[PDB]
């Protein structure tokens, strides 16, 4: 049910066109692009406080890419390879970046010398490629991840690296909260962690189809990559130790989530700061003081723009009904309607997209009325969202109880787990599900082997 | 001389790092990235008035790419090819886009149906690839063009297409004027035009080494591509005719130009709206009312930010001299110095980067003082630039006179030309130079074959 909804809204709202001759690679149409644009503004506003945006190459030579032990193994048959340059065969294969560690790190080896240099915090929003699962899914599982934001940090002590991991987590919380997206933060099992990292922390959110979606990861690379690429730095004493690194990233999935989570029967419903337009002015006219209604709207649009609004006056010549539908299925938060009546009173009608509540305000201070309304809509959408999610995280004491809940209600399954490889795999297999990760807390007994359970774990059917 | 200057400023100002294991592919460091960022804001501000930004895939399948007659021939051995997906060999080669016609057009075939649909004006800023000349050059001739803005338009009548070509030209003029970049607009010879187009209009600018640099092209594709990809549309009568297309684009070269053209002995000198910072506040302190000098600067920074300035307070603990040098070689337009004296008078010192003029203004209305100063700097830089260029465009009546001027003074050579293939080639060969293009005007006699010369032509040593 959700799948069809998603696929249809992506087309109707003209977010992306999937009809491209190469599977797993979609086109961002105008509207979709605007949403992607605003989602990124929000993200960069946060990241730019303490991170420096950069832009590295797309292609990586075998030599560099394979310098990894586990990392190369982690993307082996997952990389695309350019082998020829025209008709000529390159004397050194070039791989399309799947992620940029093997691209930036050898360069970091150069950029880093003195402890005065550290800490360095970089990031970029580029396109990465991954040859995977025959199962392609829009904005969720693509071959060309068009909105891959990857951050990489460098530190002097392993201490600061961990502190960074915590900072990243706070950055994503803030990012997501702005999108009104709820999430569950856990620590991935050591066999799911980023290839070569010390550990991986992941953010997972729940899709309307009861399935979970990883929408962000933070990895603590310790000094593994440092040693691999020789990234050393001089201490104030005169020694040469390897740096401590961490990296984290999001993808188009964030945009899928926003669409999906605040999804709706009417179409898209988006946080005001993500929508292509925050306020769409629709003048109501039947050839009765039209010249006056119009100039009332125009004046309003201009007035809103100067106040910093992303407004749009829909003066097309069609039935206001059709207009309402359009901007509604597209996700515009506020609709401002103006007609002879209201006009001849100094007021207008403001309709909400999340609720439906049409209220009446004075065109005199409307700017503030709108600003407030917007703050309200986010909080509501964010709240609703959190409720909906938490109400799907259910505890289980028996592996049997789990299988029953998952299969009947889907969602997330909370449970105490011993945290052992074999036990975990066994849990996954028996329940045909994936262990999202753990959360250290009070002990108990592993839902499976009954032994001592140091961790609170979650599992679910994932994307 | 210029070359070394360029290469050194790119490194000293930390614009791009060229030390990447793959030739023709550079890294944008923080500072460089900020300039690229602002240059693009300026560009998008213009383009977004009537164009819709989008984002198509990177990879193109042989099938589509080769659908062209001359176009495929035009990029034959110029394309990179991904042949394997992991260890598996794809059953259909994928080419990294060199430009996106073969990517967007088949999609346009779908997006276009009714004349009500046209006109459509799209554009994107993506990374394109081109396997060319062994001679790699930063921001000028790269294998991975990291800042390729390509616009594509669709029209109902060939009439509107031409009108579009004129619009594009006006858009680039405005874009360039904002960067204070001078240019010569001409019509490329029919053997240099974009592969498959009706004709190509190009913008060329002059580099400090007397060589010319193509910094923009607008192509009128007529219905050539329409027929190739079956892009038809329904007329109000009910007929089905092919659409009229045009496309135009710029690259990182625009950023090279800005750096190079307003180049300088002190380092970078950039248009206020391109610099990483428009105003850098440097407090002068020697342990004498410091606490008061500082709070005077801070207050100023905040005050400037709220006014919309990209300001930066350099409160580092170093000699103000070293600070001046840094922000000066980096291109910051205005430096605001504050010390005990000036402070205890309600005024500060404002130094210009283009001139050097340090003036004294009242911290009371300084915002407007600065805004004005900025407008002044652009106009100056733009003017200087135009003078410098026009003073290098020299007329020649004899093929011999040309060879003498080119070889001794470089620059552009104006001349009357018959406009014939063989005659043109002959001119180029004999003078070891390239014919930039023509400009229809009063007749005369071809500098070479003496026959009737319908066009005013230019030639020079190019990049
Ligand atoms: C930051 C680290 N270098 C990185 O690459 N981590 S990652 O491999 O976990 O990817 C980061 C995020 O990208 C998203 N992602 C991964 N593969 C994807 C795919 N094929 N399609 C869409 N999003 C994907 C997920 O939300 C994931 O959390
Ligand atoms: C718009 C059309 N589809 C296009 O591709 N035209 S073009 O091939 O002429 O390229 C547009 C512009 O990109 C720049 N350009 C072309 N090849 C380049 C290269 N190898 N490195 C840097 N800039 C390049 C030039 O300034 C040129 O005017
Ligand atoms: Mg698992
Ligand atoms: Mg030529
Ligand atoms: Zn167990
Ligand atoms: Zn001639």
Curated annotation (Swiss-Prot), chains A, B:
Chain residues that bind ATP: 130, 132, 214, 217, 251
PROSITE patterns with a match to the protein in the record: AA_TRNA_LIGASE_II
EC number: 6.1.1.15
Binding site for L-proline: 99, 101, 130, 219
Enzyme class name: ligase
Species: Methanothermobacter thermautotrophicus (strain ATCC 29096 / DSM 1053 / JCM 10044 / NBRC 100330 / Delta H)
Record comment regarding domains: Consists of three domains: the N-terminal catalytic domain, the anticodon-binding domain and the C-terminal extension. The C-terminal extension binds a zinc ion, which probably plays a non-essential structural role in stabilizing the fold of C-terminal domain.
HAMAP family in the record: Pro_tRNA_synth_type3
Catalytic activity reported: tRNA(Pro) + L-proline + ATP = L-prolyl-tRNA(Pro) + AMP + diphosphate
Keyword Ribosomal protein: no
Keyword Zinc: yes
Annotated Gene Ontology cellular component terms: aminoacyl-tRNA synthetase multienzyme complex; cytoplasm
InterPro entries: aa-tRNA-synt_IIb, aa-tRNA-synth_II, aa-tRNA-synth_II/BPL/LPL, Anticodon-bd, Anticodon-bd_dom_sf, Pro-tRNA-ligase_IIa, Pro-tRNA-ligase_IIa_arc-type, Pro-tRNA_ligase_II_C
Swiss-Prot/TrEMBL GO biological process terms: prolyl-tRNA aminoacylation
Subunit structure, interactors included: Homodimer. The dimer is functionally asymmetric: only one of the two active sites at a time is able to form prolyl-adenylate, and only one tRNA molecule binds per dimer. Interacts with LeuRS, which enhances tRNA(Pro) aminoacylation.
Function: Catalyzes the attachment of proline to tRNA(Pro) in a two-step reaction: proline is first activated by ATP to form Pro-AMP and then transferred to the acceptor end of tRNA(Pro). Can inadvertently accommodate and process cysteine.
Annotated binding of Zn(2+), by residue: 418, 423, 446, 449
Keywords assigned by UniProt, alphabetized: Aminoacyl-tRNA synthetase, ATP-binding, Cytoplasm, Ligase, Metal-binding, Nucleotide-binding, Protein biosynthesis, Zinc
Location within or outside the cell: Cytoplasm
Name the record gives this protein: Proline--tRNA ligase
Interaction with tRNA, as annotated region: 328-358
Record-stated family: Belongs to the class-II aminoacyl-tRNA synthetase family. ProS type 3 subfamily.
GO MF entry, a single one: ATP binding
